[PDB]
Scaffold this motif. Structure first.
Motif, short mmCIF file in Angstrom:
data_model
loop_
_atom_site.label_atom_id
_atom_site.label_comp_id
_atom_site.label_asym_id
_atom_site.label_seq_id
_atom_site.Cartn_x
_atom_site.Cartn_y
_atom_site.Cartn_z
N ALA A 50 -2.97 4.93 -2.42
CA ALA A 50 -3.18 5.58 -1.08
C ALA A 50 -4.50 5.69 -0.91
O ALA A 50 -5.26 5.62 0.16
N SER A 51 -5.48 6.19 -2.03
CA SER A 51 -6.75 6.64 -1.97
C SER A 51 -7.67 5.40 -1.76
O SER A 51 -8.91 5.50 -1.46
N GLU A 52 -7.03 4.10 -1.95
CA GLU A 52 -7.80 2.84 -1.78
C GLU A 52 -7.62 2.18 -0.55
O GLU A 52 -8.20 1.08 -0.43
N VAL A 53 -7.00 2.77 0.27
CA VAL A 53 -6.77 1.96 1.42
C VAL A 53 -7.36 3.11 2.68
O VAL A 53 -7.36 4.31 2.77
N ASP A 54 -8.40 2.49 3.58
CA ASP A 54 -9.11 3.15 4.34
C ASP A 54 -9.01 2.23 5.74
O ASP A 54 -10.25 1.76 6.02
N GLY A 55 -8.23 1.97 6.55
CA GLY A 55 -8.10 1.48 7.91
C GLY A 55 -7.69 0.38 7.82
O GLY A 55 -7.22 -0.27 8.88
N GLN A 56 -7.10 -0.36 6.65
CA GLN A 56 -6.39 -1.58 6.79
C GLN A 56 -5.22 -1.38 7.28
O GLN A 56 -4.47 -0.60 6.99
N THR A 57 -4.88 -2.60 7.70
CA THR A 57 -3.23 -2.79 7.98
C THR A 57 -2.40 -3.32 6.91
O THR A 57 -3.17 -4.31 5.91
N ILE A 58 -1.47 -2.76 6.42
CA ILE A 58 -0.60 -3.12 5.40
C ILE A 58 0.61 -3.87 5.49
O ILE A 58 1.00 -3.73 6.73
N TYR A 59 0.96 -4.43 4.63
CA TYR A 59 2.37 -5.33 4.55
C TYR A 59 3.19 -4.42 3.98
O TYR A 59 2.86 -3.63 2.70
#
Length: 330
Positions: A50-59
């Motif tokens: 989670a800490s490595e996601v910053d605004g991207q759309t996820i699958y």
């Protein structure tokens, strides 16, 4: 079949291009960086730290009725710029510009390096190099192109990247309205898994053409043009005040300069990169030192015809039994 999708620069510098891709059922649309220099289709996902996601759309594979875990498969990749990602693998339905592949390996990231986290506009990569580079273990997987090939009207895809503007990736056909003159085809070596070819030389600005073989790769996933130090020195010598800065990490030039064009050879044909395409702007906000778009490949180990070069052309990636590359002016 065919597919056609628009590709859009992520920022005002054309640092990379994103193309919308439909994954799963119902479709989940992610914006992927189509990369002819690698062979993994990987995405930010519900499994990404989670800490490595910053605004991207996820699958989210659990929301796709066609997703299936590829049991035991893992992947891990490192790119030329030092970035990396890794995770596990699903198969699912993937569509690009109306072209659909069922059973495509969709590599779900558990970890991504900081460069990926920091780029909120890139939801993953779609590799278009040869499948021999794919990193999935213990069973190597095929690229989207390789999976689609048999169904395509013609076993090709084309890259038509824009300068500070959208462009197009087409699969299965050559749009004869998208280029001027004729397409010049040149031989490809797949020995290293890349679209590797040999340019026939170069010119700087209005200078004379130097006939010399330059082996390199056509790489839509690399921003700049990386060439031998001799060639790069010859280019920057024509820009007053330009110099190689070890502190900055390459050639810089005064932002007040007007840059000369750069021509590269494809067989007897010539592709001209306008000077403006070689401007990557201030090294830091407000600086009067600007970063060059032609840089030395010394210590990369390979020359790279990245976006700076490719966006000056209409480029055919011919995946026939003997692959070739075609270049046209546009």
């Amino acid at each position: 079949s065919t597919g056609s999708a628009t590709t859009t620069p992520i920022d005002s510098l054309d640092d990379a291009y994103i193309t919308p891709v439909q994954i799963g059922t119902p479709a989940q649309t992610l914006n992927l960086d189509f990369d002819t220099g690698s062979s993994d289709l990987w995405v930010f996902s519900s499994e990404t730290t989670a800490s490595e996601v910053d605004g991207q759309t996820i699958y989210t594979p659990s929301k796709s009725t066609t997703a299936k875990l590829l049991s035991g498969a893992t992947w891990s990749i490192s790119y030329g710029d030092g970035s990396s990602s890794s995770g596990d693998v699903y198969t699912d339905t993937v569509s690009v510009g109306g072209l659909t592949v069922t059973g495509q390996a969709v590599e779900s990231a558990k970890k991504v390096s900081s460069s990926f986290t920091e780029d909120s506009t890139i939801d993953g990569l779609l590799g278009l190099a040869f499948s021999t580079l794919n990193t999935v273990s213990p069973t190597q997987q095929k690229t989207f192109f390789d999976n689609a090939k048999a169904s395509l009207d013609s076993p090709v895809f084309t890259a038509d990247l824009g300068y500070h503007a959208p462009g197009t990736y087409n699969f299965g056909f050559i749009d004869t309205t998208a280029y001027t003159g004729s397409i010049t085809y040149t031989a490809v070596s797949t020995k290293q898994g890349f679209w590797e070819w040999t340019s026939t030389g170069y010119a700087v600005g209005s200078g004379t053409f130097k006939s010399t073989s330059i082996d390199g790769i056509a790489d839509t996933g690399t921003t700049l043009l990386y060439l031998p130090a001799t060639v790069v020195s010859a280019y920057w010598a024509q820009v007053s005040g330009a110099k190689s800065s070890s502190s900055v990490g390459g050639y810089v030039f005064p932002c007040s300069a007007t840059l000369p064009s750069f021509t590269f050879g494809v067989g007897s044909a010539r592709i001209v990169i306008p000077g403006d395409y070689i401007d990557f702007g201030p090294i830091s906000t407000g600086s009067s030192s600007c970063f060059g778009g032609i840089q030395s490949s010394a210590g990369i180990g390979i020359n790279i015809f990245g976006d700076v070069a490719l966006k000056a052309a209409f480029v055919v990636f011919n995946g026939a039994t003997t692959p070739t590359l075609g270049f046209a002016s546009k």
